[PDB]
C-alpha cells in the first residue's frame, strides 16, 4: 500500500 511517491 506504500507504492512510492504519490
Amino acid at each position: 500500500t506504500d507504492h512510492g511517491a504519490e
Epitope: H3, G4, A5, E6
Partner: antibody, heavy 122, light 108 residues
Framework: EVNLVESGGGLEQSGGSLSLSCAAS????????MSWVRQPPGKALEWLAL??????????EYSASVKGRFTISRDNSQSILYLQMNALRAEDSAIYYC?????????????WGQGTLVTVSA | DVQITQSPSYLAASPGETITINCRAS??????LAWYREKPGKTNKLLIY???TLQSGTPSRFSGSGSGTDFTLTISRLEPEDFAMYYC?????????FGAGTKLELKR
C-alpha cells in the same frame, strides 16, 4: 483500450508560448494521475510535470529544471490534459509525451502516447 | 535530485538468451524503481514497478530486484519484441528521474 493522443506540437520561435493537448480515452480520467515527459532527439527522457487525481484534489508537481515555464492542467469533463509552455527556447525542442499511472504506483507511467514534436528554432 | 546511472548502454543478444541491466541511484530510493521498453512505432511499456513487481501484461521472464541504491533488471528467454531500448526510473521522490537507457540489439 486506453489511448492517449498528444497534439499541438509544431514550429515556434524562441520567446513565445505554445500549448499542447493530450486526449485521453478508454479509462475514467478523473481517477488517474497524468504527466508530461519529454525526449529530445539525442537525449534522455525528462519528466516535466504531474497532476494528481480527484481524490488528491488535482494538485501538481513540477521539475525545477524548466524554471516554472510550463503549467500542467486538466479539463475533466472533456478528458483532456494540457501543457502550457511559456518563454520557449531552442533547448525545449523534443518529443512531448503524455502519460497515465498504473493505478497503484502513482508516480509510474503505465500508458503513454506516441508524442507530439515541438521545434523551437529560428 | 536523484541521479540514476544505468549500465551497460549497449547489449547484443539472440532470442532465447538472457541479459541483465543495472541501475544505481545516487541516494536511496527505497524499493521504488520502474523499468520501461521503448520501440519505434510503439508507445512506451511499463514492465516492472517497485523494484520487483510485474506490471499487468509483462511476461514472467522479466525479473527485477534491489533496494536502496542498487537495482537490476534481467530478461530471460528473449523474444523478438524484446529487442528494443530500456530505461529505469525512480518513483520514490520528485523530481521523477530516469536512467540514460540501454539499447538491446539483435546479434547477427
Amino acid at each position: 483500450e486506453v489511448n492517449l493522443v498528444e497534439s499541438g506540437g509544431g514550429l515556434e520561435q524562441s520567446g513565445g508560448s505554445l500549448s499542447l493537448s493530450c486526449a485521453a480515452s478508454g479509462f475514467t480520467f478523473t481517477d488517474y494521475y497524468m504527466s508530461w515527459v519529454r525526449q529530445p532527439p539525442g537525449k534522455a527522457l525528462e519528466w516535466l510535470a504531474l497532476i494528481r487525481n480527484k481524490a488528491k484534489g488535482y494538485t501538481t508537481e513540477y521539475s525545477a529544471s524548466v524554471k516554472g515555464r510550463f503549467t500542467i492542467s486538466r479539463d475533466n469533463s472533456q478528458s483532456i490534459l494540457y501543457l502550457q509552455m511559456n518563454a520557449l527556447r531552442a533547448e525545449d525542442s523534443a518529443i512531448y509525451y503524455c502519460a497515465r499511472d498504473n493505478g497503484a504506483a502513482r508516480a509510474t507511467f503505465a500508458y503513454w502516447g506516441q508524442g507530439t514534436l515541438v521545434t523551437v528554432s529560428a | 535530485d536523484v541521479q540514476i546511472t544505468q549500465s551497460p548502454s549497449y547489449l547484443a543478444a539472440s532470442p532465447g538468451e538472457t541479459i541483465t541491466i543495472n541501475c544505481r541511484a545516487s541516494k536511496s530510493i527505497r524499493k521504488f524503481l520502474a523499468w520501461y521498453r521503448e520501440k519505434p512505432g510503439k508507445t512506451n511499456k511499463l514492465l516492472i514497478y517497485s523494484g520487483s513487481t510485474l506490471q499487468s501484461g509483462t511476461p514472467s521472464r522479466f525479473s527485477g530486484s534491489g533496494s536502496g541504491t542498487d537495482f537490476t533488471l534481467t530478461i530471460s528467454r528473449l523474444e523478438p519484441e524484446d529487442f528494443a531500448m530500456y530505461y529505469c526510473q525512480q518513483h520514490n521522490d520528485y523530481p521523477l528521474t530516469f536512467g540514460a537507457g540501454t539499447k538491446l540489439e539483435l546479434k547477427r
